[PDB]
RNA sequence: GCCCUGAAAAUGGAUGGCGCUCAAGCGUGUUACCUAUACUCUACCGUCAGGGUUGAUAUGAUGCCCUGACGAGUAGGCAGG
RNA sequence: AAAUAUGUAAGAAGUCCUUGUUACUUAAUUGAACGUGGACAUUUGAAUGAAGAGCUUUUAGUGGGCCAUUUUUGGUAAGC
RNA sequence: GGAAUACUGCCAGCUGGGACUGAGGACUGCGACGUAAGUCAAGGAUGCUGGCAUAAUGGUUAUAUGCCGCCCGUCUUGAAACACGGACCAAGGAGUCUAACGUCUAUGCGAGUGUUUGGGUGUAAAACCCAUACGCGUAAUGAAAGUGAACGUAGGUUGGGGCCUCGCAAGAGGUGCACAAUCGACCGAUCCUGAUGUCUUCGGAUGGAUUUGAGUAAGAGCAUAGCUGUUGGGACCCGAAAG
RNA sequence: GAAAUUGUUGAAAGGGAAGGGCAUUUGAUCAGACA
């Protein structure tokens, strides 16, 4: 990570600063839209009691 | 004085600051150095290693005096000259007229060499010298005169 | 010496936050959202009323 | 010495008050209290007497009259909070009253002025009272809670 | 209640006045808190503290240890400050001019210092001369040269001087102290 | 010596500048807020329209309330409780949600109640029981200069700047949120709604993530 | 499932007692309500901490002043009295 | 082959470059270790918290314990 | 097709009733309303009116009434215990003094320190004075014979308050006591090496070593006193069977 | 000339102990502060 950080720091410096290179933890996920083209919700119910034995 | 004393403060508390379980009884350890080799050995090795047993030669009817021999280091030496007298000698450091110092008269038996005396002749009367002590002195241009 | 709540005490409301004057002036607390028509795909309602 | 004198004494200077901020703002009476309204008196010398509200005086009190010759109550002060304000109203629109103020009741038998003032106000009111029938009797009579009366439910 | 996370009502654990009862000291301290409070010079609050120091945490600065300090690079004209007694050292032969400011100069110390054309200054004169302690060199004496710390930390393999009265052989130098008598330390 | 009105001015007027700045800043967030809010509302509709499903971003900010007393708490939760500055009952703090605090929350569910807090309730938190940690000391907010004083380093020079940095979980949330002393609220006014507190919300008790239902509570206790 | 049978001990006696049967019982739901030395706000005492203030021409500088947080306790320690 | 629990790492005591020292070491100024000189600052390298951190001396009482949930041994069992 | 309503949520929308509190004591702040003068609910209660001026309020006390409250001391895991002591009251009634000590602190003097064995002196067991020694300290180390502390600015390195210099400030460099880490040098012990020389076995320079010491490396001590702690003492007080 | 303990006088309470805590009624007693 250090070798890597030194890089994208000089890669950024020689560019126009703007870095952000601390590790941040898992962020919550963003909004998003889920389609139905090809995908209508299948409805499930719970199932009666059985045995097989 | 009693008045500053912690017993004064314990008055009214049942057990005088000595426990209700463990009490203040007469002598639990045993008395004195009892059990140095048993229930008190942990405290004796650590804090007093080397305590038990023997090492060395016995010397019957030794008389300290026989071995009387205060040391003085060149470190001082120049002290034994009274101060006013001192600079009279520090300046005009030379052969032909250099201070005599009877270190025995000062009440020393050996002259050791803890380091550096000015570059100035002294005549040093002593009973004993360390090899270095004497060397250093000669480097100022003095000598050591053995006496008794 | 004695904490005054805004929320109650109108005076210190306005000590903090100057916007409170226009906020209240322009109602805002009761803003009338612009009315739109957009109605949901049959897929949406179908599967809503499915079992 | 019996006792050994403090090493420090308090100042006997009294400080001045912090400049308090407590404006005396005017008291708006409950809407139910309007000049010409009959009042039930909940307390006092004339407790339970039924009486006419006349003017709101500058010391917050209410000016009332009985009228005297109906029920014996003279022009008088009464505290707005010891007073059930009914729903029955007589017009007070011909009753000068503006004469009457706090100074008028400077404590300091009965001043011929008062005895006069009283008759002049009561004549106006009786003129009025006598319009609605049985009002005069109503005013003549004291009020009392009967068995069964539940103040938190009666309309007055 | 509160799940406390730290002992409640703990005293700072630092002195706040001297423990001593000496007016003069109480005065010096009076001066220096005033200086410490109204000068933002860091040199003053350092002193203010040391004035509370117990005699142990006040080992003497020797006049030779002073002459050494002035042999620092660019230090020979600084005025050393010592918040304790200063003592004389027969072992230096050449002592410099300077200006030593202290709580006490021993007879010899002040002697030697002055003989070299120096000046012994009380801490309050040091104040008037140098309110922000301009140009001062604060020296401390050797705290750990005390005879007592010799015995602190006593235990096996720590090599640290028995608490012992009479010494010489026959005095704790056998079993436990050599390889030929049970074991060694 | 001038100053009379002289440097009374150079202050007083300069004070007006700051209210100016604050006024426009607050008017701004208000826009920000509505149009953010409204943008979701129309996102959900626009999707239904299109035969699809708008799944909101998971929440970035939660608000935690210690629900359990002080005793018989096992070490690991008890340490974490401290780490989130919840060391007495009914006090409460904001927590920025990441995996690495999410796991914290996880560990202390049986002792706290928490959910997503509205703008309405972060505002009435800060306005009414908002205190700063200033050389410790726990100073009440109550004037904007108390804030600019310390949170100003970071932008943020008002009680509403505070709130904003908190609800939007800004780039300086660590500093902003820590500045606020753990809120110390009372017991829910009209009770907990449950007969037994120490169960999950789902099981009819009070602890756990009860989501947007945190607000209804936090109010009653504030 | 509830209820009954299965179901035997020694002074008279215990859903805590009275007593309760579309319960004052069993399961389950929904509200309201009662009340801890706990929580919230406030006063006062004390402890610890951070600030301020030797400037006379009046009285404690170990003082005076501002501010914050904290307070269970045997054995035991220390402090001020 | 889990769950719980457990070692280490997450930078200034950092990462590179330039080429001194030795008796060690290499076929070998090869290496090893310790350096000199030079290049890069707080998004200087995850989170949360921190009424601060470190360090020293000395001494009391105590060294019969018992209980709960879970794991668990002996015992038919036990308020063992 | 087009409304209503429920439900959930929001308002820095308005508004009624009731309760507890009124800390502070010139001014000083942040504000609010005014075109303005000014006003205000804005860094903590004021106004107006009445009653008593006394046992009215309040304290104390006895009793009654609601709720609540087992006997202390003790050993104990656990006592109100069907565990011990204690019928009652007064007066006695138990961590002391000493010798030598550890840590800490205050004070005197400081490479020194300690007048009080003694002498001198006296307003007489006081206070005042003092010669010589002595004690502890200023050298360690070896069983001992013995030997005995600078390669160097009394060393290098790393942190280090403070001070110095530059800078408006931030910072940057310079120096760095104490203290801490580390690598070294010095003295003794141990082992090795064994020059110049020599009463031919003395002598032991010199340079070394995973060895070792309560050491050196610009002294910190000595003395008085105190709390706590240690040991011997009848040793906190009372107690055997015994010898 | 204390206390335990006792006699008289006065006041009060007492359905198988008495004493105690918070609170107030009632009786007795009392300090202050008022101008
Ligand atoms: Mg003693
Ligand atoms: Mg005494
Ligand atoms: Mg005493
Ligand atoms: Mg005590
Ligand atoms: Mg005590
Ligand atoms: Mg006592
Ligand atoms: Mg105790
Ligand atoms: Mg003790
Ligand atoms: Mg006992
Ligand atoms: Mg022996
Ligand atoms: Mg020496
Ligand atoms: Mg006003
Ligand atoms: Mg009104
Ligand atoms: Mg009539
Ligand atoms: Mg020494
Ligand atoms: Mg539980
Ligand atoms: Mg947090
Ligand atoms: Mg409510
Ligand atoms: Mg309700
Ligand atoms: Mg309620
Ligand atoms: Mg229940
Ligand atoms: Mg509330
Ligand atoms: Mg049964
Ligand atoms: Mg029942
Ligand atoms: Mg039921
Ligand atoms: Mg109901
Ligand atoms: Mg309470
Ligand atoms: Mg306590
Ligand atoms: Mg405690
Ligand atoms: Mg782990
Ligand atoms: Mg923090
Ligand atoms: Mg801190
Ligand atoms: Mg201990
Ligand atoms: Mg022990
Ligand atoms: Mg035992
Ligand atoms: Mg448990
Ligand atoms: Mg007041
Ligand atoms: Mg007041
Ligand atoms: Mg009276
Ligand atoms: Mg009366
Ligand atoms: Mg009684
Ligand atoms: Mg009971
Ligand atoms: Mg016992
Ligand atoms: Mg037992
Ligand atoms: Mg008992
Ligand atoms: Mg029993
Ligand atoms: Mg017994
Ligand atoms: Mg008995
Ligand atoms: Mg007794
Ligand atoms: Mg007695
Ligand atoms: Mg005599
Ligand atoms: Mg004389
Ligand atoms: Mg003589
Ligand atoms: Mg000696
Ligand atoms: Mg020899
Ligand atoms: Mg020797
Ligand atoms: Mg090196
Ligand atoms: Mg530097
Ligand atoms: Mg350097
Ligand atoms: Mg050696
Ligand atoms: Mg050896
Ligand atoms: Mg020694
Ligand atoms: Mg020694
Ligand atoms: Mg003893
Ligand atoms: Mg006996
Ligand atoms: Mg006997
Ligand atoms: Mg006998
Ligand atoms: Mg025998
Ligand atoms: Mg007699
Ligand atoms: Mg009586
Ligand atoms: Mg009472």
Coordinates of N, CA and C in Angstrom, one line a residue, chain E residues 74-163:
Chain E
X74 N 28.0 28.5 21.7 CA 27.3 29.8 21.7 C 26.6 30.1 23.1
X75 N 27.1 29.5 24.2 CA 26.4 29.6 25.4 C 27.2 30.4 26.5
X76 N 28.4 30.8 26.2 CA 29.3 31.3 27.3 C 28.9 32.7 27.9
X77 N 27.9 33.3 27.3 CA 27.5 34.6 27.7 C 26.1 34.5 28.2
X78 N 25.6 33.3 28.3 CA 24.2 33.2 28.7 C 24.3 33.3 30.2
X79 N 23.2 33.5 30.9 CA 23.3 33.5 32.4 C 22.6 32.3 32.9
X80 N 23.3 31.4 33.6 CA 22.7 30.2 34.1 C 21.8 30.4 35.3
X81 N 20.8 29.7 35.3 CA 19.8 29.7 36.3 C 19.8 28.4 37.0
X82 N 19.6 28.3 38.3 CA 19.7 27.1 39.1 C 18.7 27.2 40.2
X83 N 17.6 26.4 40.2 CA 16.6 26.6 41.2 C 16.8 25.7 42.4
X84 N 18.0 25.8 43.0 CA 18.5 25.0 44.1 C 19.8 25.5 44.6
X85 N 20.5 24.8 45.4 CA 21.8 25.4 45.9 C 22.8 25.1 44.8
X86 N 23.8 26.0 44.8 CA 25.0 25.7 43.9 C 26.2 25.5 44.8
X87 N 27.0 24.6 44.4 CA 28.2 24.2 45.2 C 29.5 24.2 44.5
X88 N 30.6 24.3 45.2 CA 31.9 24.5 44.7 C 32.6 23.2 44.3
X89 N 33.5 23.3 43.3 CA 34.1 22.0 42.9 C 35.7 22.2 42.7
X90 N 36.4 21.8 43.7 CA 37.9 21.9 43.7 C 38.6 21.4 42.5
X91 N 37.8 20.7 41.6 CA 38.4 20.0 40.5 C 38.6 20.8 39.3
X92 N 37.8 21.9 39.1 CA 38.0 22.7 37.9 C 39.1 23.7 38.3
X93 N 40.0 24.0 37.4 CA 41.0 25.0 37.7 C 40.7 26.3 37.0
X94 N 40.2 26.3 35.8 CA 39.8 27.5 35.2 C 38.3 27.7 35.2
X95 N 37.8 28.7 35.8 CA 36.3 29.0 35.9 C 36.1 30.3 35.2
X96 N 35.0 30.4 34.4 CA 34.6 31.6 33.6 C 34.0 32.7 34.3
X97 N 33.7 33.8 33.6 CA 33.1 35.0 34.1 C 31.6 34.6 34.6
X98 N 30.7 34.6 33.6 CA 29.2 34.5 33.9 C 28.5 35.0 35.1
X99 N 27.2 34.7 35.1 CA 26.2 35.2 36.0 C 25.2 34.1 36.4
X100 N 25.4 33.6 37.6 CA 24.7 32.5 38.0 C 23.6 32.9 38.9
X101 N 22.4 32.5 38.6 CA 21.3 32.9 39.5 C 20.7 31.7 40.2
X102 N 20.6 31.8 41.5 CA 20.2 30.6 42.3 C 19.4 30.8 43.5
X103 N 19.1 29.8 44.2 CA 18.5 29.8 45.5 C 19.5 30.0 46.6
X104 N 20.6 29.2 46.5 CA 21.7 29.3 47.4 C 23.0 29.1 46.7
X105 N 24.0 29.9 47.1 CA 25.4 29.6 46.7 C 26.1 29.2 48.0
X106 N 26.8 28.1 48.0 CA 27.6 27.8 49.2 C 28.7 28.8 49.3
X107 N 29.3 28.8 50.4 CA 30.4 29.8 50.6 C 31.4 29.6 49.4
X108 N 31.9 28.4 49.2 CA 33.0 28.2 48.2 C 32.5 28.5 46.8
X109 N 31.2 28.2 46.6 CA 30.7 28.3 45.2 C 30.7 29.7 44.8
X110 N 30.2 30.6 45.7 CA 30.0 32.0 45.4 C 31.4 32.6 45.3
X111 N 32.2 32.3 46.3 CA 33.7 32.5 46.3 C 34.2 32.4 44.9
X112 N 34.5 31.1 44.5 CA 35.1 30.8 43.2 C 34.5 31.6 42.0
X113 N 33.1 31.6 41.9 CA 32.4 32.3 40.9 C 32.8 33.8 40.8
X114 N 32.9 34.4 42.0 CA 33.3 35.8 42.1 C 34.7 36.1 41.8
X115 N 35.6 35.2 42.4 CA 37.0 35.3 42.1 C 37.2 35.4 40.6
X116 N 36.4 34.7 39.8 CA 36.6 34.8 38.3 C 35.9 36.0 37.7
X117 N 35.4 36.9 38.5 CA 34.8 38.1 38.0 C 33.3 37.9 37.7
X118 N 32.7 36.9 38.3 CA 31.4 36.6 38.0 C 30.4 37.4 38.9
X119 N 29.2 36.8 39.0 CA 28.1 37.5 39.8 C 27.1 36.5 40.2
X120 N 26.8 36.5 41.6 CA 25.8 35.6 42.1 C 24.5 36.4 42.3
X121 N 23.5 35.9 41.7 CA 22.2 36.6 41.5 C 21.1 35.8 42.2
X122 N 20.2 36.4 43.0 CA 19.0 35.7 43.5 C 18.0 35.7 42.4
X123 N 17.1 34.7 42.6 CA 16.1 34.5 41.5 C 15.2 35.7 41.3
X124 N 15.2 36.6 42.3 CA 14.3 37.7 42.1 C 15.0 38.8 41.3
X125 N 16.3 38.8 41.4 CA 17.1 39.8 40.7 C 17.1 39.3 39.2
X126 N 17.1 38.0 39.1 CA 17.1 37.4 37.8 C 15.8 37.8 37.1
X127 N 14.8 38.0 38.0 CA 13.5 38.3 37.4 C 13.5 39.8 36.9
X128 N 13.9 40.7 37.7 CA 14.0 42.1 37.2 C 14.9 42.2 36.0
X129 N 15.9 41.3 35.9 CA 16.8 41.5 34.8 C 16.3 40.9 33.5
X130 N 15.5 39.9 33.7 CA 15.1 39.0 32.5 C 13.7 38.5 32.8
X131 N 12.7 39.4 32.7 CA 11.3 39.0 32.9 C 10.8 37.8 32.1
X132 N 11.3 37.6 30.9 CA 11.0 36.5 30.1 C 12.2 35.5 30.1
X133 N 13.0 35.7 31.1 CA 14.2 34.9 31.2 C 15.1 34.9 30.0
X134 N 15.1 36.1 29.3 CA 15.9 36.3 28.1 C 17.3 35.8 28.4
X135 N 17.9 35.1 27.4 CA 19.3 34.7 27.5 C 19.7 33.9 28.7
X136 N 18.8 33.2 29.4 CA 19.0 32.2 30.5 C 19.3 30.8 30.0
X137 N 20.1 30.1 30.8 CA 20.4 28.7 30.6 C 20.1 27.9 31.9
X138 N 18.9 27.3 31.9 CA 18.5 26.5 33.1 C 19.3 25.2 33.3
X139 N 20.0 25.0 34.3 CA 20.6 23.7 34.6 C 19.9 23.0 35.8
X140 N 19.9 21.7 35.7 CA 19.4 20.8 36.7 C 20.5 19.9 37.3
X141 N 20.5 19.6 38.5 CA 21.5 18.6 39.0 C 21.1 17.2 38.8
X142 N 22.0 16.3 39.0 CA 21.8 14.8 38.8 C 20.8 14.2 39.9
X143 N 19.6 14.0 39.5 CA 18.6 13.4 40.4 C 19.0 12.0 40.8
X144 N 19.5 11.2 39.9 CA 19.6 9.8 40.1 C 20.9 9.3 40.8
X145 N 21.8 10.3 41.1 CA 23.0 10.1 41.8 C 22.8 10.0 43.3
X146 N 21.5 9.9 43.7 CA 21.2 9.8 45.1 C 21.6 8.4 45.5
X147 N 22.0 8.2 46.8 CA 22.4 6.9 47.3 C 21.2 6.0 47.3
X148 N 20.0 6.6 47.4 CA 18.9 5.8 47.6 C 18.5 5.0 46.4
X149 N 18.7 5.6 45.2 CA 18.2 5.0 44.0 C 19.0 3.8 43.8
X150 N 20.2 3.7 44.4 CA 21.0 2.5 44.4 C 20.3 1.2 44.7
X151 N 19.2 1.3 45.4 CA 18.6 0.1 46.1 C 17.2 -0.1 45.5
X152 N 16.7 0.9 44.8 CA 15.5 0.8 44.1 C 15.6 -0.3 43.1
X153 N 14.6 -1.1 42.9 CA 14.6 -2.1 41.8 C 15.4 -3.4 42.1
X154 N 15.6 -3.6 43.4 CA 16.3 -4.7 43.9 C 15.6 -6.0 43.6
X155 N 16.3 -7.0 43.0 CA 15.8 -8.3 42.7 C 16.9 -9.1 41.9
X156 N 16.6 -10.4 41.7 CA 17.6 -11.3 40.9 C 17.9 -10.7 39.6
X157 N 19.2 -10.8 39.2 CA 19.8 -10.4 37.9 C 19.6 -8.9 37.7
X158 N 19.3 -8.1 38.7 CA 19.2 -6.7 38.4 C 20.4 -5.9 38.9
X159 N 21.3 -6.6 39.6 CA 22.5 -6.0 40.0 C 22.5 -4.6 40.7
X160 N 22.0 -4.5 41.9 CA 21.6 -3.2 42.3 C 21.8 -3.0 43.8
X161 N 22.8 -3.6 44.5 CA 23.1 -3.1 45.8 C 22.0 -3.4 46.8
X162 N 22.3 -4.4 47.7 CA 21.6 -4.9 48.8 C 21.3 -3.8 49.8
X163 N 20.1 -3.7 50.4 CA 20.1 -2.8 51.6 C 20.9 -3.4 52.7

